[PDB]
Design an enzyme around this catalytic site. Structure first.
Site, PDB file in Angstrom:
ATOM      1  N   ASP A  82      43.613 110.992  89.690  1.00 47.41           N
ATOM      2  CA  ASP A  82      42.954 111.185  88.418  1.00 47.41           C
ATOM      3  C   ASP A  82      43.250 110.007  87.495  1.00 47.41           C
ATOM      4  OD1 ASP A  82      42.652 114.110  86.145  1.00 47.41           O
ATOM      5  OD2 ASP A  82      41.298 112.476  86.494  1.00 47.41           O
ATOM      6  N   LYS A  83      42.422 109.886  86.453  1.00 50.00           N
ATOM      7  CA  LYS A  83      42.543 108.857  85.435  1.00 50.00           C
ATOM      8  C   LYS A  83      42.350 109.478  84.070  1.00 50.00           C
ATOM      9  CE  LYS A  83      40.033 106.769  82.861  1.00 50.00           C
ATOM     10  NZ  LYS A  83      39.905 107.066  81.396  1.00 50.00           N
ATOM     11  N   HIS A  84      43.372 109.393  83.233  1.00 46.04           N
ATOM     12  CA  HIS A  84      43.287 109.937  81.891  1.00 46.04           C
ATOM     13  C   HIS A  84      43.416 108.840  80.843  1.00 46.04           C
ATOM     14  CE1 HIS A  84      43.367 113.919  79.786  1.00 46.04           C
ATOM     15  NE2 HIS A  84      43.521 113.068  78.787  1.00 46.04           N
ATOM     16  N   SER A  85      42.732 108.992  79.723  1.00 44.62           N
ATOM     17  CA  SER A  85      42.822 108.029  78.628  1.00 44.62           C
ATOM     18  C   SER A  85      43.524 108.650  77.417  1.00 44.62           C
ATOM     19  CB  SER A  85      41.423 107.596  78.245  1.00 44.62           C
ATOM     20  OG  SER A  85      41.453 106.572  77.283  1.00 44.62           O
ATOM     21  N   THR A 122      35.633 114.070  76.551  1.00 43.20           N
ATOM     22  CA  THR A 122      34.801 114.038  77.732  1.00 43.20           C
ATOM     23  C   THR A 122      34.056 115.360  77.844  1.00 43.20           C
ATOM     24  OG1 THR A 122      36.427 112.587  78.835  1.00 43.20           O
ATOM     25  CG2 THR A 122      34.848 113.650  80.222  1.00 43.20           C
ATOM     26  N   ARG A 170      46.478 120.584  66.646  1.00 46.41           N
ATOM     27  CA  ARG A 170      46.830 119.217  66.337  1.00 46.41           C
ATOM     28  C   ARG A 170      45.669 118.455  65.729  1.00 46.41           C
ATOM     29  NH1 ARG A 170      48.076 117.121  71.827  1.00 46.41           N
ATOM     30  NH2 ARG A 170      48.603 115.184  70.710  1.00 46.41           N
ATOM     31  N   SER A 185      50.840 116.965  76.561  1.00 38.73           N
ATOM     32  CA  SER A 185      49.443 117.368  76.684  1.00 38.73           C
ATOM     33  C   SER A 185      48.776 116.691  77.926  1.00 38.73           C
ATOM     34  CB  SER A 185      48.704 117.039  75.388  1.00 38.73           C
ATOM     35  OG  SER A 185      47.353 117.451  75.418  1.00 38.73           O
ATOM     36  N   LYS A 189      48.436 118.714  82.012  1.00 37.73           N
ATOM     37  CA  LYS A 189      47.149 118.804  82.672  1.00 37.73           C
ATOM     38  C   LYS A 189      47.211 118.208  84.083  1.00 37.73           C
ATOM     39  CE  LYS A 189      44.401 118.244  78.549  1.00 37.73           C
ATOM     40  NZ  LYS A 189      45.634 117.730  77.954  1.00 37.73           N
ATOM     41  N   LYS A 190      47.792 117.019  84.164  1.00 36.78           N
ATOM     42  CA  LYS A 190      47.765 116.254  85.388  1.00 36.78           C
ATOM     43  C   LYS A 190      48.729 116.855  86.393  1.00 36.78           C
ATOM     44  CE  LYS A 190      44.780 115.015  83.744  1.00 36.78           C
ATOM     45  NZ  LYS A 190      43.361 114.594  83.728  1.00 36.78           N
TER      46      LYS A 190
HETATM   47  N1  LIG Z   1      41.201 110.756  75.974  1.00 32.63           N
HETATM   48  C1  LIG Z   1      41.166 111.601  74.988  1.00 32.63           C
HETATM   49  C2  LIG Z   1      39.880 112.234  74.459  1.00 32.63           C
HETATM   50  C3  LIG Z   1      40.385 112.901  73.142  1.00 32.63           C
HETATM   51  C4  LIG Z   1      41.930 112.923  73.218  1.00 32.63           C
HETATM   52  N2  LIG Z   1      42.294 111.974  74.292  1.00 32.63           N
HETATM   53  C5  LIG Z   1      43.688 111.515  74.579  1.00 32.63           C
HETATM   54  C6  LIG Z   1      44.537 112.781  74.721  1.00 32.63           C
HETATM   55  N3  LIG Z   1      44.259 113.676  75.723  1.00 32.63           N
HETATM   56  C7  LIG Z   1      44.930 114.837  75.889  1.00 32.63           C
HETATM   57  O1  LIG Z   1      44.608 115.584  76.805  1.00 32.63           O
HETATM   58  N4  LIG Z   1      45.928 115.165  75.046  1.00 32.63           N
HETATM   59  C8  LIG Z   1      46.256 114.319  74.060  1.00 32.63           C
HETATM   60  O2  LIG Z   1      47.172 114.599  73.323  1.00 32.63           O
HETATM   61  C9  LIG Z   1      45.544 113.100  73.871  1.00 32.63           C
HETATM   62 CL1  LIG Z   1      45.988 112.044  72.572  1.00 32.63          CL
END
Ligand SMILES: N=C1CCCN1Cc1[nH]c(=O)[nH]c(=O)c1Cl
Ligand SMILES: N=C1CCCN1Cc1[nH]c(=O)[nH]c(=O)c1Cl
Lengths: 438, 438
Positions: A82-85, A122, A170, A185, A189-190
């Site tokens: 996975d890839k998270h931003s 997303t 938040r 957070s 998830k990951k």
């Molecule tokens: N990439 C994105 C889209 C809106 C928020 N975000 C980063 C993120 N993601 C999270 O799941 N939790 C956070 O605290 C944060 Cl910060």
């Protein structure tokens, strides 16, 4: 068991919360006992007094364990990525990358979220597609990975429910930019995704405008990740300008499809290949970054990423006829099939000049105003960095549901546009730098 | 107008809020727009980052102005006084002092509150009296001052509504012990009363256990008060032990009546005369503290304070027959007319010893547990400071609605009792020290 006001006090006074303390709070978030005001109070208490790594780690375990841990057939183990931003304006990289990576043979069960702060989410973007449902159960997610190789789902009663509640809270209480809250957070998830590798795009210039803070976040994601048995790496990328040409929900689905047609703006494509490349390398499916980046590039060009995206859409409830029309249609056909705004309004260059950049933050602030969700609202950048424009030429097209932009909001967008007397030039590509587990 | 998350951030970063900022927030508290989590977040932000005097002052003006300012016939101007406490365990001084002062020719429109922290609230105590209604409009309050000389009412839609909402929220979020929040909560109430003089009992050893903090609160009440055209003075009083013999709601009405019969414990009587005396001096109705203290003492002894209290009760909705029976009845007759608890349980001395003190805080914590409102729940101190007791003799009688006290809560009350090997002695009177406007 301690009551909430006692445990709030412990953190408010610079104190460190134990594991039972953290779990007590989180479990009260989940059952309704922590009232809104107590959640707001503890969040602010954490935001201002911080948590250290033992505590962040437990916070992460606790949000992860508020719901189910996801399990896959042993055969998929090393293919799950996975890839998270951590968030950027116009960042639609995830929409492209989940299907592109599926088409490279990965399985991608992305748990993502909604708008947080002034960065868009997303989940909100995918929801502009009629019939696209983000709530998907663990059993249903296994079917999505079978049919499409990937999915994009939100938090819910069965997956990280506590991060969904804390996340929504938040957003409205100025406790978004908290290292430990972000880490827990994202990582929570990951963790429930049961991944072999994760890459996290950390942007600056973004939730932490300052280069120094972004680095600290990156090593905290990576360090805390590694201590929980997750192979994490982070990329640091300077996003003071929006990625690509679009900001919105429907507008960004449209541009992500353009990218999946093997077109689209060069900066969006570059970060998709850079980040997916990195991920393939980290997961051991590519020997080098360039080999990885080219594998992902080839999926964008041969129509296969697009094909995975159509499978994903239909598998998450988009009418199959509508999914085909979207992926196979022309740009124009996609703009009629997806929410448009009630009206469009162009903004004009005030004077001659060369575009140095469009500033991300003024743009996001104004559109959060007009977005206050409305899935056709957004903006469109009609000029590139490096371009010489004359007085009067359109540079932004704002898609809005309300009235003509007010005097103020108009001025506020107009400040986003930064012109120099520098000779024209070609727009450089975005900045990237990896961070590994030490 | 700014949105809430923006203004929360301003304070969270150590920033100073303007007057329009403060008013915006408060007005959003009043209309429902500030959600619970945002109120919790701003309260914690203020609690940890503080406010300076300009800001506290505006906060006070803003809570005061969320409702009506009260007005009286010019003839009453110099007779309008009040006495507020920052909180103490077993402190029922207000119940006695409002009618005692009315019987000395003062008019006393006390706006008071509910339980906050672990100190009990006057409003909750009066509510143990069947038919006693704390919500009273401005017009109705003028009738109360005519008939009785005094009243005790809560915050409501028309009086300081915003302090009622912030007050209830602070109670559960560990933002009670905030100098500026206390100052603005107390002063706002007293400002709308349109008083000529106000005295505020500041206890320590109490919301601020430390002598240093209590002094700072006292000079902040007095200083901020004086800048808003209110003649304020404060008394500092060391309350590490409960005042009198009773803690509760019904139990404290009972003991306040005992005081109004000209009996009761000497410490309760002493602080009533000391504080009312002070108030009469400050308002210019007594030449000295001792003259003032004796005027108030004479009202407790001649039955006239009691008579004002009966007028007050009937005027705020207590059946007149029931008000007469309460004021005229014997101690025993009053215990049958007022809520009792389901059961009573005595606690026994563990060993021989001389009572050095009963500790206020362990007692309040345990009864807040058992009080979680139930208006017959409470405790009764069966021993005095200085008394030599033997092993086995009852020292506390807990009135409770639930089951037999658990092993834990029993131990926790038992720690309240502090015995020495010191020879017996007479119980000293409580400590007092005034603070004037500089
Ligand atoms: N990439 C994105 C889209 C809106 C928020 N975000 C980063 C993120 N993601 C999270 O799941 N939790 C956070 O605290 C944060 Cl910060
Ligand atoms: N005397 C009492 C009974 C419970 C609370 N309290 C002091 C007080 N009163 C207020 O009105 N506001 C406060 O913040 C505070 Cl603190």
């Amino acid at each position: 068991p301690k009551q909430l006001p006692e445990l709030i006090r412990m953190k408010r006074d610079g104190g460190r919360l134990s594991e039972a303390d953290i779990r007590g709070f989180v479990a009260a978030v989940v059952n309704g006992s922590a009232q809104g005001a107590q959640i707001g109070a503890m969040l602010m208490a954490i935001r201002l007094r911080g948590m250290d790594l033992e505590e962040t780690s437990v916070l992460t375990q606790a949000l992860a364990q508020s719901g189910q841990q996801l399990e896959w057939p042993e055969a998929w183990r090393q293919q799950l990525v996975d890839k998270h931003s951590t968030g950027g304006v116009g960042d639609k990289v995830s929409l492209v990358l989940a299907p592109a990576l599926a088409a490279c043979g990965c399985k991608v069960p992305m748990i993502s979220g909604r708008g947080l702060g002034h960065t868009g989410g997303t989940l909100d973007k995918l929801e502009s597609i009629p019939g696209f449902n983000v709530i998907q159960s663990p059993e249903q997610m296994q079917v999505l990975l079978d049919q499409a190789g990937c999915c994009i789902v939100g938090q819910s009663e069965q997956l990280v429910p506590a991060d969904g509640i804390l996340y929504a809270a938040r957003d409205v209480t100025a406790t978004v930019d908290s290292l430990p809250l972000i880490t827990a957070s994202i990582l929570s998830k990951k963790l429930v995704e049961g991944l072999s590798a994760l890459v996290v795009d950390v942007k600056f210039g973004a939730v932490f405008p300052n280069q120094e803070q972004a680095r600290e976040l990156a090593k905290t994601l990576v360090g805390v990740g590694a201590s929980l048995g997750l192979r994490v790496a982070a990329a640091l990328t300077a996003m003071d300008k929006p990625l690509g040409r679009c900001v919105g929900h429907a507008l960004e689905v449209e541009e992500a499809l353009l990218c999946m047609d093997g077109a689209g703006p060069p900066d969006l494509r570059d970060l998709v290949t850079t980040l997916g490349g990195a991920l393939l390398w980290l997961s051991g499916h590519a020997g080098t970054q360039a080999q990885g980046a080219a594998r992902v590039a080839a999926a964008l060009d041969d129509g296969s990423a697009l094909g995975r995206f159509e499978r994903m859409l239909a598998a998450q409830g988009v009418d199959p006829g509508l999914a085909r029309a979207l992926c196979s249609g022309s740009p124009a056909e996609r703009r009629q099939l997806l929410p448009r705004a009630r009206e469009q309004e162009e903004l004009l260059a005030p004077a001659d000049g060369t575009v140095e950049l469009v500033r991300a933050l003024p743009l996001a602030l104004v559109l959060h105003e007009l977005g206050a969700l409305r899935l056709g609202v957004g903006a469109e950048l009609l000029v590139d960095v490096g371009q010489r424009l004359r007085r009067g030429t359109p540079w932004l097209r704002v898609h809005r549901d309300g009235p003509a932009l007010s005097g103020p909001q108009s001025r506020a967008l107009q400040e986003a546009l930064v012109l120099s007397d520098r000779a024209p030039f070609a727009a450089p590509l975005p900045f990237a730098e990896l961070v590994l587990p030490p």
